[PDB]
Symmetry: C4
Subunit: 494 residues, 4 copies
C-alpha cells in the first residue's frame, strides 16, 4: 500500500523519493501531471504499463472506466491519455495494450462502447498520428492534401470483428439502458460504414424481405377471408381446385408463421436479457413472436375440433397487418414517423387511459346506480353509452328511466364537459408538446433501427460468402515495430 499512502499525500516532488522503496490506480483514479510521466523511470524499478491490476484489468480499461463524459474532464483526459499511451508505446514497441482484454473479456474500445462514451469512443476510433515510429497506434491516415480537396482513410479494425465481437455490435446491442446508445453511431466512420453496407447489399435484400412479407400477408389474408363455414374443423377436402388453392394458402400461412416463431425465439436465445430490455426495447421482435403464437394456437384449435380457431386466427391477421409497419424503417420520412407513433403510444396511452378510465368508470357506475327497472340497467351497456360520447355519437337522452332525471342530466353534462371538451383537447395539446420534444429522439432511433437491420443481415447472411469487407487488401503503413508489410482493409472517405 506504499503508493496508496503516496498518492494520499499527493505531493508533487516526493514521488521521486518514495519509489526508492498500484501504478494503474495512480494513472487512472488520479491522473496527476508528474506521476504518470515518471512511473516508467523510477530509480528502484519502473512501472510495467502492460501489467494487470488486482482483478486482471490493464491500464487502458481503468483509463476508460474513469472517464465520465464531461467537457472539461474530456479536454484534459484526451491529452493526458494520448501522451501517456504514446510514451508507453514508443518505449515498448513489441506489444500493444488495447488488444488484451479485461477480466470480462472486453477490449478498451468494447468497454468504452458498452458503458456508453463519446469523447473516449471517438478518441479511440479516430486516432491520428503524423510522426514516424508513432503511426503504430494510429487509425486515421491522410493520402491527399489539396486546398479544397481533403481525403483520408480509416482502418476500421474491430468494427467488423476482432474475431470475438465488434464495437458496432456493442453499441447496437447494448442493454437499452445505456445513456447514449444512439449517439455513439454519430462517430466519423460508423455512419458512413453503415451507409455503404446499406448501399451495397442490405438495401436490396431488406426490400426483398419486405416484398416477400407483403406477399405472405396477402396470401394469409386471402386464406382467412375464404375460410370454410361449416362447424367441427378440419374439413373433408374435394378435388375442386378451390380447395387446393385454399390449402395452399393455409400451408403458406402456417409455414410463414412458424418460420417467424423460430426467428423470434432464436433472436431471444442469442441474448437472454434479464427481463429488462424486453420492456425497454425489442418491441419489433416481441410483436412478431406474438403473431406466431396466435397462429399456432389457431392451428392447434383447428385440428382440435374447436370452432373458435377463427377467434385466434383473426387476431394474428390483425396483428399481422399492423406489423407491416415494422418495415417502415429504411425510409427517410416513413420510418421516423412510424417510430414517433410507437413511442407516443408507449409514453402516452397508459397515462391517458388511466385518467379517462377513472372518469368513465366513475360516471358510468354513477348513472347505472341512478337508473333502475324491474335496457341500460347493465353496467356494460352504460359503459358503452358513455363511451360513445368520445367518438361523437353521445345521445344525452339515451334512456327515459325516471327517478331524478335532473341529477341524471347534470351527471351526463359534467361527464361530457370533463371528457369530451376538456380531456381530449388536453390530450391533443400534450401530444403536440410531446412531438415537438421527441423529433430528435425519433431521428436517433430510426438510425438505430437501420443499424439493427444491417447487423442482422450481415450476421445471419445464410450464404457463407465474404460479402462484408470494405475496400480490399489495402496496404496502409508498412512501418511497424517489425519491418513487415500490412493489409488491414481500410475504408476511404473524402
Amino acid at each position: 500500500t506504499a503508493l496508496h499512502i503516496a498518492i494520499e499525500r499527493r505531493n508533487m516532488t516526493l514521488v521521486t523519493l518514495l519509489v526508492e522503496n498500484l501504478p494503474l490506480s495512480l494513472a487512472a483514479c488520479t491522473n496527476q501531471l508528474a506521476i504518470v510521466k515518471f512511473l516508467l523511470q523510477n530509480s528502484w524499478q519502473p512501472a510495467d504499463i502492460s501489467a494487470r491490476d488486482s482483478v486482471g484489468n490493464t491500464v487502458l480499461h481503468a483509463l476508460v472506466e474513469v472517464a465520465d463524459n464531461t467537457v472539461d474532464n474530456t479536454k484534459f483526459v484526451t491529452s493526458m491519455y494520448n501522451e501517456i499511451l504514446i510514451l508507453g508505446a514508443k518505449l515498448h514497441p513489441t506489444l500493444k495494450l488495447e488488444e488484451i482484454t479485461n477480466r470480462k473479456g472486453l477490449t478498451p474500445l468494447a468497454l468504452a462502447a458498452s458503458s456508453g462514451k463519446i469523447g473516449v469512443l471517438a478518441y479511440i476510433l479516430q486516432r491520428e498520428i503524423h510522426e514516424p515510429e508513432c503511426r503504430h497506434l494510429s487509425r486515421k491516415f491522410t493520402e491527399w492534401a489539396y486546398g479544397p480537396v481533403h481525403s483520408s482513410l480509416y482502418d476500421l479494425s474491430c468494427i467488423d470483428t476482432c474475431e470475438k465481437n465488434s464495437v458496432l455490435e456493442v453499441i447496437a446491442y447494448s442493454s437499452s439502458e445505456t445513456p447514449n446508445r444512439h449517439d455513439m453511431l454519430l462517430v466519423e466512420p460508423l455512419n458512413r460504414l453503415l451507409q455503404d453496407k446499406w448501399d451495397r447489399f442490405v438495401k436490396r435484400i431488406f426490400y426483398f424481405n419486405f416484398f416477400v412479407y407483403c406477399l405472405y400477408m396477402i396470401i394469409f389474408t386471402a386464406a382467412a377471408y375464404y375460410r370454410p363455414v361449416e362447424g367441427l374443423p378440419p374439413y373433408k377436402l374435394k378435388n375442386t381446385v378451390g380447395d387446393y388453392f385454399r390449402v395452399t394458402g393455409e400451408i403458406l400461412s402456417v409455414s410463414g408463421g412458424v418460420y417467424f416463431f423460430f426467428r423470434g425465439i432464436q433472436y431471444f436465445l442469442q441474448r437472454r436479457p434479464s427481463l429488462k430490455s424486453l420492456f425497454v426495447d425489442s418491441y419489433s421482435e416481441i410483436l412478431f413472436f406474438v403473431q406466431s403464437l396466435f397462429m399456432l394456437v389457431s392451428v392447434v384449435l383447428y385440428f382440435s375440433q374447436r370452432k373458435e380457431y377463427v377467434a385466434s386466427m383473426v387476431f394474428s391477421l390483425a396483428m399481422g397487418w399492423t406489423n407491416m409497419l415494422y418495415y417502415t424503417r429504411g425510409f427517410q420520412q416513413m420510418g421516423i414517423y412510424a417510430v414517433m407513433i410507437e413511442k407516443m403510444i408507449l409514453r402516452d396511452l397508459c397515462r391517458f387511459m388511466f385518467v379517462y378510465l377513472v372518469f368513465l368508470f366513475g360516471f358510468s357506475t354513477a348513472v347505472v346506480t341512478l337508473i333502475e327497472d324491474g335496457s341500460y340497467n347493465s353496467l356494460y351497456s352504460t359503459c358503452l353509452e358513455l363511451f360513445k360520447f368520445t367518438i361523437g355519437m353521445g345521445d344525452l337522452e339515451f334512456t327515459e328511466n325516471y327517478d331524478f332525471k335532473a341529477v341524471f342530466i347534470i351527471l351526463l353534462l359534467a361527464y361530457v364537459i370533463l371528457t369530451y371538451i376538456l380531456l381530449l383537447n388536453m390530450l391533443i395539446a400534450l401530444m403536440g408538446e410531446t412531438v415537438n420534444k421527441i423529433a430528435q429522439e425519433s431521428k436517433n432511433i430510426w438510425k438505430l433501427q437501420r443499424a439493427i437491420t444491417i447487423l442482422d443481415t450481415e450476421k445471419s447472411f445464410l450464404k457463407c460468402m465474404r460479402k462484408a469487407f470494405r475496400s480490399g487488401k489495402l496496404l496502409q503503413v508498412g512501418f511497424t515495430p517489425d519491418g513487415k508489410d500490412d493489409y488491414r482493409w481500410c475504408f476511404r472517405v473524402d
Copy 2:
C-alpha cells in the same frame, strides 16, 4: 436620534463624533460598510447586536426582512451578513444570535422562508466556515475531498423540528401567495432529505393508503350498485347472506366516509385560513370533504324515509371515483400530468365557458324566439339542441316550424361557425400554448405535493416512534465555546 441623523447624512468621518452622545435600524435599513463595521467600536458604548429593537426583533430578523432576493443585492448582502455573523461570533462567544425568536416567535431562518427567499434562505441553510474555533455557526461540513470524489455533511437542525416548527413546514405550509414557495424546496438539503424520507417510510405507507382507498371505493361502488329498489328506506333485513353483505358494504362505506369527514375537518381546524389559501390552495381536502358531506346527507335522507338518498349517494360515488386521481401524486409520470390537468381546468374553464355560454344562451333564446306553436317550443330543449352541435350531433333541421326558415337557417349556421368551428379550435390552440407555458410550474407543484405527503405522514404517524432522524447521533465538531461534545444528526451527501 443622534444615530438617525448620523445614518441619514452618511458622512464617512463624522460618524465617530455623533456617537459620543437605533444601531439595529442603522445596520439593517441601509447596510453601509462603515456603519456595520463601526457600531461595534463606538467611543461611548458599542452596539449590542444581540439586543432587540423597539418591537422585540433582533438584528438578524431585520437583516432578513430588508433583504429583497435579487442577484446584485444578494451578493453584497451575503458578504455583509456573513461579516456580521463572524464578528458577532468571535466577539460574543457565549451565545448564538439566530436562536432568539422575533416578536412573532420566528427565527431568521423561518422568517426568510415565510417571506420567500432563495439566496438568503440558501445562505442561512448552507453556512460554511474555514477557521478553527469559528465552526460554532457552521452548517456545511466536509469529510472526503479527492480530485473527483467530494462528499459533505449537513446538520439539518430545525429542518425536521426545533421543537416548535421547522423550515420545511414553513416552506410547504406557506400562505399560498408567497412568490417562491415551490422553488424553496430545490435547495441542497431539502430536496435530498425529502427524497430520502420518501425512500425510507413514506412511499410504502402512501401506496398502502392508496390500495386501502381503492378497496374502499370498490366496496362502496358495489354497495351502491346492488342497492334495493323498494320505496321508503330503511328496509327490513332478512337472514339471507346477501343482505348481510350489502349491509357490510354500507357500513364500510359510511365508516370510511365519516373518517374522511374527520380528516378534512381536523385539517381545517389545524389551519383555519382566512379564505386566502382556502381557494388558491387546499383543493384536494375540500374535495374529499365534499364527498364526505354528500355521504352524510345520503345517510340522513336514508333514515329520513326519503328516496332522494339515491340522488345524494351517487354524487358522492361520482366524486369518490374522481378523487381517486388525488393519489397520482407519488408517480413521476402520472402525478405531474394530473396536476397539469387540474390547473388547466382551474385556469381555463371559467373563461371558456363564459364565452361559450354567452353564445349558447344568445342563439338558443334567439331561435326559440323565432319558432312558435299552439316540440322545441321550450327554452330548455332548444338549449339542448344547440348544445348537441358541440358534441358533433347537431342536426341543422331539428324542427319544421315555419315562420322564416331562412333567418332560422342563417342563425343556426352562424352559431355553428362561431361555436363548433371557431371557438372549439380556439380552445384547443389556447390549451396548446398554455401547456408549453405551464410544464415547469407543473413539475414544481408535483414536487410540492410530494412534500405535503411526506410532512403529513411524518407528523401524525400514529406510532409514537422516532422514525424521523437521518443518520444517528453523529459527532460533527466537538469544539464549542465550551469543551463539550455534540450530537446533531448530520446527513451525508456527495
Copy 3:
C-alpha cells in the same frame, strides 16, 4: 438658399464666415455638431430659435418630424436636441418654445404622439434637470433618493389637457394606422395614470354600466320570449297585468336601443373618419350601432302591420347577447382572451372560408350534376349534405340515385379527405401558430381598450365636478424666469 448649400458643403471653418452675410432646416434636417451652436451665437446676427419656417412650423416641430425611431439615430437625437434646447432656453429665458402650435395646430408633444414615437415621446414626457436656472424646462423631479427607496413627481402638463387636447387622447384616438398607437402607453406616467383613474372612479362606473346593460339584455330577452302569437301587429292590450309587464319590457327595450343608437352616432360625428379607422378599428361601436339599427327596423315593421318584425327583432337579440362580450375589457384574463378571439375571427375567417367554400361549392355542384331524377336534386340540399360532414354527421350514402355510384363515392371520399381530414386539421394548426404569434399584441390591445374606456368616461362624465386632478396643489420649483410659485397638480410616484 445660401444656408442649404452651406450645410451640404458642411465645412467646419466656413460656418463662421458665410454667416457674415433657413437655420431651422439646417438644425433639423442635418443636425450638424458645430453649425447649430454657431447659428444662435453668430458674430453678425444670431438666428431666432423661436421663429417659424416658410409654412409656420417652429424649430421643435421639425425636430420632432425628423426623428424616425431608430436606436443609433435616437441616441444622437436625444443629446443633440436636449443640448440645443437648453442653450436656447438659457439664451431666451422669457419664452417657452413648446407651447406654440404648428400649422396644423399641434404642439411638439402632440405631433410626436400622432406620428407614433417612443424615444422621442418618452424624452418629451420625462425631462429631468438637476441644476438651478435650468429646471425651467424640466418635467421630472426627485424628492427622495436612497439606494432602494426612491420617490419622485411628474408634472403631467397636457396629459390632462392643454385647453385643446391631451397627449393621451392623441395616442388613443390615433388614425388606427399609426405604427405605435399601442406602445405609446408604455411610458412611465401614462400607465400609472390610467391605473389610478381606473382605481378611482372608472372601475365602479364601468361595472355599473355593465350591470345595467345586463339587466337591459335580460329585460329585452324576456320581452322577446313572451311576444304575442297573433298576426297583424300592433295588438290590442288588455288590463291584465301581464300585458303591462310585456309593454314595460318592450318600452325599456326600445328605449335602451335608441339610446345606443344615439351613443354610436354621436361617437361617429365626434370623429368622422375617412373610412380608414372605420374598418381597421371601431368594431365595438359599429356592432352596437348595428344592434340598434335592427331594433329600429323591428319597431318600424311592428307598427307597419308586418309580421317580419319578429325576424328583425331576433337578429338584434342575437347580436345583443354577443355584444355582452364587449364588457370583457376590465378583466385581466377575460378581456385579453376575448380580444384574441376577435382578432382570430378577423384575420382568419375570410382566408379559411374562402378555401372551404371553394371546395364545398365545387364538390356540391359536382355531385348535384351527377345525380338526377324525374330529393337532393336541388343544389341547396346537397350543399347542406356536404356541409354536414364538417360537423361530423356526414352520411356517405345520402342518396340512392344511380348513374355511376362509383364516381359518386369517389367524389365524396375525396371531399371528405380534403375537407374533414386535411382542411380542418390545418385550420387548427394555423390557429395554434396564430395564437403563439398574437400572445403579446393582445395585452397591448386590452390596455388600449381600457384607455378608451377611461377616456370616454372622463369625456362624458355627466356630473360637471372637478374629480380629475392628480395630487393637489403640490409646489415643485419656485424658480421660474419669474420668481413666482408654481401650482400645476403634479402626480406622486415612488
Copy 4:
C-alpha cells in the same frame, strides 16, 4: 503540366522562375495570393486573362464554379476575385470578360444563378467601384448624397434580357433541385423590379385573367347543372332559346378547355423537363392540363353516343373549381396560406394515409373474417363501416352477427383507440409542428410564384409593345474606353 506541378508544390518564390518555361486553373482551383497578381507580369509572357480553358470556360466561369457558398470562404473570395478582375480589366480595357459564354452558352452571371449562388451572384449583380477609369465594370452607382437621403441608379443589364436569356429567368426556371432557387430573388434589385412590374402591368392583367377564369368556371358550372337527361347523346336541338343558352355554355366550356390544353402543352414544349420538375414542381400547370384532358374525354364520349361523358365531365368540373385556388397567388395572405396547404398535402398525405390504410385494411379484413351469414359479409361495406369511425359516425354495433361478439368488440375498440383517438390526434399534432417548421419557406415559394407569374405575362404578352423597360434612356457614365455616350435603361432606387 508545368503549372500543375508548380501549384501542387505551392512555393511562394519559385513562381518567378518556373514561368521562364493552366492559369485559369491556378487562379480558380487554388486562388493563391502571389501567383494571380504575378501571372500577368511574367518574364517570358503574361497570362491572357481573357483566354479560355481546354473546354471553353473563361476565367470568370471557373472563378464562379469553384465558389461553394461558405461565409469565411466567401469573404476571401469577393476581395480576391474583385482585385484580380479589376487589374485584368485596367490592363485590357478594350474587352469585357463577362460577355463570352461558356461551353454551355451561359454567361458567368447566368452560370452562377443556375448553380444557385448567393455571395457570388450578389457580387456579380452589385459590383461597386470608387475610382476614375475603373467604373467601367460597375453596376451600382451613387448619384444623390444628402444627409438623410441616399439614392442611386442600377444598370440591370441582362436582368431583363441579354438577347438570349436573363438572370431572373434562370433563378425562376431553375431545375427545381437548386438549393437556393427561391432565396436568389432576395438580391437588391430583383425584389424591387418584380414589385414594380407587378405594380405597373402584371397586377391588372393577372386580376383580369382571374375574373375571366371565374366567369369561365361559372359558365361551365351552369352548363353542367342544366345538362339534358335523355339517353344517347348528342341530343336534337330545338329553337327554344334555352337550348341556345345551353349550347352557348357548352361551346364556351369546351373552347376554354382546349385553350387550356394548348397552354399546358405549349408550356411543356417550351421546357421539356427531364421528368424531374414534373414531380418536384410544376403542379400548378399539370392540374390545369389534367382538367383539359378530362374535358376532351367528355366531349369525345359525348359525340360517341355514350352516357359516361357525365362521369368525365364532373371530374373536370370538380378539378376546375379546385384549380380556382391557383389564383390565390398575388395576395399577401391568401396565396401564402394556399401554398402552405398544397405543401402540407404533398408532404403529409402519403405518409399518413399509409399508416391509416394499413390499420383500416387490417381491421376490416379481421372483422369480415369473423362475421358471416348465409349484410356486411362483403369486405367493401365493412371497409366503409370502419371508415365511418373517422368521421364521427362509428356505430360499435354495426352488425348482430354472432360467433364471438367478445373478440369482435375487442377488435372494434382497439381499432377506435388506434385510429380515432391516437393516430388522428397525432396527425393534428404533426401538422402543428410542420406548420411552424414551414412558416418562412412558404413566403419564399409565394414570391417565387409571383416571379413565375410576372415572367410568363411579360414574355408572352401578345402585344409586341415595349411595356418592359424600367426608367427610360438614362445615361450613366459617358466615359468609356471610347469617348462615346451611353444609354442603358437604368432603374431608380431610393
